[PDB]
Amino acid sequence: YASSPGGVYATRSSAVRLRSSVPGVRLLQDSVDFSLADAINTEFKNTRTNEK
């Protein structure tokens, strides 16, 4: 037998990484969150440690 590991296409997130307009006219509203999305990346680590 020969199982392929192909299909693992990691999507590079490419957020603008610049605050509103030039150096900004707002600051509070930039969505402090994304350590949620990296804690969901460890949820999908522990989900695959579960699922398998």
Partner: protein, 52 residues
């Protein structure tokens, strides 16, 4: 990334302040006039001895 930074431009029109309707500064920064009138109070009674 946004923020909740307040976005005031000029934002309530643009025209200066309320603010100077140019109240006319009349030229009473001149000197008040010289009231130099004169009374010829003497020659108007031609006081001469015709007894000659």
């Amino acid at each position: 990334m946004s923020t909740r930074s307040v976005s005031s431009s000029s934002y309530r029109r643009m025209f200066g302040g309320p603010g100077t309707a140019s109240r006319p500064s009349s030229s009473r920064s001149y000197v008040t006039t010289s009231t130099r009138t004169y009374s010829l109070g003497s020659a108007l009674r031609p006081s001469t001895s015709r007894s000659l």
